[PDB]
C-alpha cells in the first residue's frame, strides 16, 4: 500500500487539473459569449443600419432615374412659369414628334418636308402647362403646320443712291428692303430681316410679320421706273454714308466726308472704294470700313476646343475569410474531444 | 445661292431660298405621372426618399399656381 | 488481490492522458477563437466603418442637393442665361412670396386681385436679374409688372383687301387700322401687331412699349369708314391680292381673278366655293379656307393625347437576423455542463 | 484498507464522468463557435460585400454626375431649347474661354476692354447652336457679338401730343422722331422702338437689325422742329390726346379737354393737380402721374428684402470599436490555465 | 365675345375683351445662402461632398462674372 | 445724365449715353466628350450607373435629331 497513499494524492491532483481546466473553459465561454453578442447585437445591427441607408439612397437615385422626363418637365415649366419657348426633347420625344407630324392635315410630301425640318418645328412651336392634379402634370404642345414649302423666296437689301448737281443732293432709297416669299395668288413680304430665319437654303417666316403684296412688286427688281407698281422708295436731300450687309456680300454708300475702304483681318486696307454705290462680295474682302468703324463681311472663325471629363472608377474591394487554417484546427478539436472521451470510457471500463 | 446687284437702285436681290410658311396649328396633349414609391420605414426619421417626394410634391404644388386651367 | 490497485493505476493514467487531450483541444479552440475575434474586430469592423463612411458621404451629398434646392436652382437658371431670366420662375420667387409682394403693390384692391388671379402672367411679364455673387451668397432682384389699368373695353380689328373691277381695271382699298385697341383715360391705345398683345380668357395683356395713343374718334372708322370726322388710315392699290386673314371668331377671305377659294371641313374636303370678292366666314361655318392648293386652318387641330406613368420605385432593404435564441441555448448548455463538471469533481474529492 | 481502494475506485468512476460531462460541454462550445464562424465568414461578409457593391454603384453614379457636370448641363440646355440657346450660357463657354475669345477679336484695345467689362451682354446678345452629336461627343458652336463701335454720343427722344385750342376746336402736332438715336461715323442710326436698345450703365446695346440710318441733320429737329434743313416727321391731328410719356429721368403729361391729370405720391395720394396743357416732370418732383384713375409710376417702386438660408448639412458617421481589453484578458487567462492544468497532470502522473 | 363683319371695309371687329395694362415695376430683392456643411473627415482622399462643394464654389465664381453690379 | 425738356415739341431729349454697336460675329467650336467609366460587374440586377449611362445615351440619341447638320 506504499502505492495507495500516492495513488490518492494523484487522483486528487487530477481532480484539481480538471477543476482548473474547467475554470479556463468557463472563462473561454464567457469570452465567446461577449463576441457572440457583439456580433449578434452590435455588429449585425450596424450592417443592417448601413443596409437601410444604402436602400434609402438606391431608392432616391432610382426615383430620379425612373421619373426623369417628369422631373424635367417640372423644371422647364417652373423655369418659364407655364410656357416653354420651344418644344423640348422632354416635352415631346422625337418618336412622338414624328408621329404627330405624321398625322397633320397635309400631303404626304409636305409631311416628308416637315419631317426634314423637325428642329424648326420644335422651335417655332411651344408647350403649355395646363394643370397639376395630384401627382400628374398635364400640358399641351403646339406644333406648326407647314402647308407651304419649297416656293421661290428672296431677300432685298439697299443703300442710299445719292446723285449731286451743284452743291445739292438728290437721294433715292428703296424702302422695299426685307424678305419676299412667294405664295398662291400673292407674295408675302416680311419687312424686317429679323422676321425670317435661315436654316440652309430654307427660310422660316413668322406668319404674323407677313403682309400680302401684289406679285407685280417683283417688277422693281428689273426696272425701278416701272409704271405697273408703286415702288416704295423715299427721297432725301442729304447724303448718308452707310454699310448694308447681304448674305453673299455688302452694299456701301460712300458720300461727302467719309473714308470707305475694303480690308482684310490679318493685313490691313487693300482697296479704297469710290464715292457712290459699291457692291462687294464675301470673297472680295473681309471687312468694309466707314471712317473708323470696321464691318465684318463674314463670320470670323475662332478657336476650336476639345474637353473630356475625368474618368470614373469602381471602388469595389470585397473581403473574404482565410477559412482553411481555422476550419482544420476546429475539426482537430472535435477529434481531441472524441479521443479523450473514448479514452475515459476505456479507463472507466478498465475497472472490472 | 445667287446674289445680284442692281446698280439702278443701289440694291441687291439674293434668290434661291426655299419657303417654310406656317399655315395652321396642330396640338398634342401629354399627361405625365410620377411612379409609385414604396414607404421606406426603416430609417430613423428623415428618410432621403421621403424627402425627395416632399420636395417634388411641393414643386408640383407650386407649379400648379401657373396651370392654364386656373 | 492488490493487482486490482495496479489496474486502477493504469486506468487513472489513461484518464489523465484523456484530460490532457481534451485540454490541448480546448487550447486549439481558444487560439481559433482568438483569430475569429481579431478577424471580426479588425478586418470586419474596419470594412463596415469604411462603408459607414462612404454611406455618410453620399448621404451628405444628396442631403446637400436637397437642403439647397432653391439656391442651386436659382444659380442654374442664371448660368443658363448669363444673369437675366425670361420670366419670374418658381425658384426665383415662391408663390407665397409672389402673393405677398403683389398684395403690397401700390394700386387699388381690384387690380391687386386681378394680378393675384393671373400670377402666371405676373411671372412671365416680369423677370429676374442677377445682382452679384458675394462669397457663398447669391444676390438677385425680381421685377414684377404692376397692372394698374384693368377692365377697360378692348377689341381687335382684322382686315383684308377690298378690290373693285371695271373691265380689267382694279381699285383696291385696304384698312391700315389693323391691330388691338384698348380704351383708356383720355385716349385709346392701339397696338399695331397681334403679337403685341397676349390673350388670356377675356383679358388682353399688352406690351406697354408697343402701344400707340390715338384719338378716341378713330373708333368711328368702325361705323362709317368714309367718315369725315377722323383721318381713317386706308391704303389704295392697283392690283388684286387674294389672301386669308384670320379673326378670333372666324376668317376673312379675298378671292380675285384666277384663284379657287373654298371653305372646307375635316373628313370631307370642301363644302363651299367662295364668291370672287370679300367673304367673311365663322369658326363654326367651316374649318378650313383654301386658296388654290394651299389649305389654311381656322382653328387648332387636335392631335394625339398621351398618358405616361413612370416605372415603380421599389425597396431593396432585406435585413439580416441573428438566430440568437438557439445559440444562447447552446451557451446555457455549456455553462451548465461546466458547473456540473466542477460539482462532480467536488463529490469525487469528497468520496476519498 | 481494501475498502479505501474501493472508495478510490468509486471516486475515479465519478471523476471520469465529470471529465466526460465537461467534454460534451466543450464539444457544444465548439458547435457554437463553428456556427458562429460560419455565420460571420459566410452570411455576414456576403451582406457586407453586397453593400460594398451598392456603395460602389452609388458612388459611381454621383461621381459620374460630378466629373461630367458640364457635359450633362450642355445637353440639358440644348434639349430644353431644341438645338439653339437664347444665351451663351456659363456651361457653353467659361469665363476664361469667353475672355480669350474676346481678346482675340478683330477690333481695337478699348473695344476689347469694353466687351470684357460687359461680358454679360456679350453672352446674352450671342447664342449657341448645336452642330452635332456623334457617339458620346457633343459638337456645338458658340456665336459671340463683335462690338466694334463704342463710346460714341447717343441719346433718346420722347414726346407727347401738343394740342392747341381756338374757339373750342383743336389742332395737335406730335413728333414721330421718338426712339433711340446713336451717332455713327458719317451717319446717325435711329432705332424707332424703345425695346430695341438695352441700357447697362451709361452704355446702350442696340439691336443691329432695328437700326435705320438717318441724315445727321435730324439733330436739327431738336432745336427748331420746323427747320427747313430737314423734313421732320411730325403728325397733325384734330382731336385731343391726353397721355403720359415716360422719360428716363421723368415724364411728359398732355392734359386736354375733360381729364384731371394730377401728380401723386405712393403713400399719400394725389398731391397736386397739373395744368391743362403740356407739363414735364422729374423723378424727384413726384413719384406718380395720374390721368383720371390711371396711375403711372415714374420710377421703379422698390419693395421688400429677403434673406434665406439653407438647412445645415451634418454628418452621420458613427464608427465602431470592440472593447478588446476585457476579451483579450479572458483568452490569455484560459491559455495559462491550460498550461497549469496540463503541468498538474504531469505531476499527477509523476508521483506514480 | 362679339365679332362683327364690317362689309363696307372688308374688315372685322371683335369686342368683349378687358384690358390688363402694365403701369409700373415693383421689385423685390433676394439673398440666398448655402447651408453650412460639416467637414467630412472620414474619407480616404476625395470626398463626394467636398468635391460637390468646390463644384458649387466654381459655379458661383463663374456666376459672379455675369452679375448686374460691376 | 442729362435730360432736357423741349417745350416747342412737347418732347424730351436725353443725352449722355454711350454707344455699343455690333459689327460682326466671332465663333468658337467645342467638342465635349463623356469621361470613361469602368464597368461594375457585381451588378446582381441592373446597375445604377449603367442606368445613368443608358439614360444619357438615350438623351444624346434624342439630341442628335436637333443637331445643325441635316
Ligand atoms: C454595443 O451595443 C450596446 C447596445 O446595443 C451598447 O450599450 C454598447 O455601448 C455598444 N458597444 C459598442 C462598443 O458599440
Ligand atoms: C424702264 O427703263 C427704260 C429706260 O432704259 C424706260 O423706258 C423707263 O424708265 C422704264 N420703263 C417704263 C415702262 O417706265
Ligand atoms: C409611412 O409609414 C409611417 C409610419 O409607419 C406613416 O406615418 C406614414 O404616413 C407612411 N407614409 C405613407 C406614404 O404610407
Ligand atoms: C486583415 O487585416 C490586417 C490588419 O489588421 C492585415 O494585415 C491583413 O493583411 C488583412 N487581410 C487579410 C488577413 O486577409
Ligand atoms: C357715311 O359718311 C359720309 C360722310 O359723313 C356720308 O356722305 C355718307 O352718307 C355716310 N353714310 C351713311 C349711311 O350715313
Ligand atoms: C444564410 O442564412 C440563411 C438562414 O439565416 C440560410 O438559409 C442560408 O443558407 C445562409 N447562407 C447563404 C449563403 O444564404
Ligand atoms: C424757326 O423757323 C422759323 C421759320 O420761318 C423762323 O422764322 C424762326 O425764327 C425759327 N426759330 C428759331 C428760334 O430759330
Ligand atoms: C476640412 O478638413 C481638412 C483636414 O485637413 C482641412 O485641411 C480643411 O481645411 C477643412 N475644410 C474646412 C472648410 O474647414
Ligand atoms: C461592361 O463594360 C465593358 C467595357 O468596359 C463593355 O465592353 C461590356 O459590354 C459591358 N458589359 C455589358 C454591356 O454587359
PDB file of C-alpha atoms in Angstrom, chain B residues 2 4 6 12 14 17 21-24 26 28 33 42-44 47 49 53-54 56 58-59 61-62 64 67 69-70:
ATOM      1  CA  UNK B   2     -27.325  83.763-106.246  1.00  0.00           C
ATOM      2  CA  UNK B   4     -27.490  90.026-107.976  1.00  0.00           C
ATOM      3  CA  UNK B   6     -28.995  96.228-109.096  1.00  0.00           C
ATOM      4  CA  UNK B  12     -29.301  93.573-104.008  1.00  0.00           C
ATOM      5  CA  UNK B  14     -30.492  87.299-103.267  1.00  0.00           C
ATOM      6  CA  UNK B  17     -34.179  80.470-100.870  1.00  0.00           C
ATOM      7  CA  UNK B  21     -44.631  79.060 -94.028  1.00  0.00           C
ATOM      8  CA  UNK B  22     -46.869  78.205 -91.117  1.00  0.00           C
ATOM      9  CA  UNK B  23     -50.439  77.671 -92.265  1.00  0.00           C
ATOM     10  CA  UNK B  24     -52.072  76.313 -89.054  1.00  0.00           C
ATOM     11  CA  UNK B  26     -51.576  71.016 -84.611  1.00  0.00           C
ATOM     12  CA  UNK B  28     -50.949  67.126 -78.719  1.00  0.00           C
ATOM     13  CA  UNK B  33     -47.414  60.794 -63.718  1.00  0.00           C
ATOM     14  CA  UNK B  42     -36.561  51.520 -41.753  1.00  0.00           C
ATOM     15  CA  UNK B  43     -34.723  54.834 -41.413  1.00  0.00           C
ATOM     16  CA  UNK B  44     -34.839  56.881 -38.237  1.00  0.00           C
ATOM     17  CA  UNK B  47     -35.532  59.210 -44.997  1.00  0.00           C
ATOM     18  CA  UNK B  49     -36.613  59.210 -50.494  1.00  0.00           C
ATOM     19  CA  UNK B  53     -41.102  63.142 -52.641  1.00  0.00           C
ATOM     20  CA  UNK B  54     -41.885  66.005 -50.324  1.00  0.00           C
ATOM     21  CA  UNK B  56     -41.281  67.190 -55.747  1.00  0.00           C
ATOM     22  CA  UNK B  58     -44.048  70.922 -53.166  1.00  0.00           C
ATOM     23  CA  UNK B  59     -42.532  71.665 -56.575  1.00  0.00           C
ATOM     24  CA  UNK B  61     -47.909  72.194 -55.584  1.00  0.00           C
ATOM     25  CA  UNK B  62     -46.154  75.381 -56.637  1.00  0.00           C
ATOM     26  CA  UNK B  64     -49.904  74.364 -60.116  1.00  0.00           C
ATOM     27  CA  UNK B  67     -51.557  75.999 -64.661  1.00  0.00           C
ATOM     28  CA  UNK B  69     -56.952  75.724 -66.058  1.00  0.00           C
ATOM     29  CA  UNK B  70     -56.834  78.391 -63.330  1.00  0.00           C
TER      30      UNK B  70
END
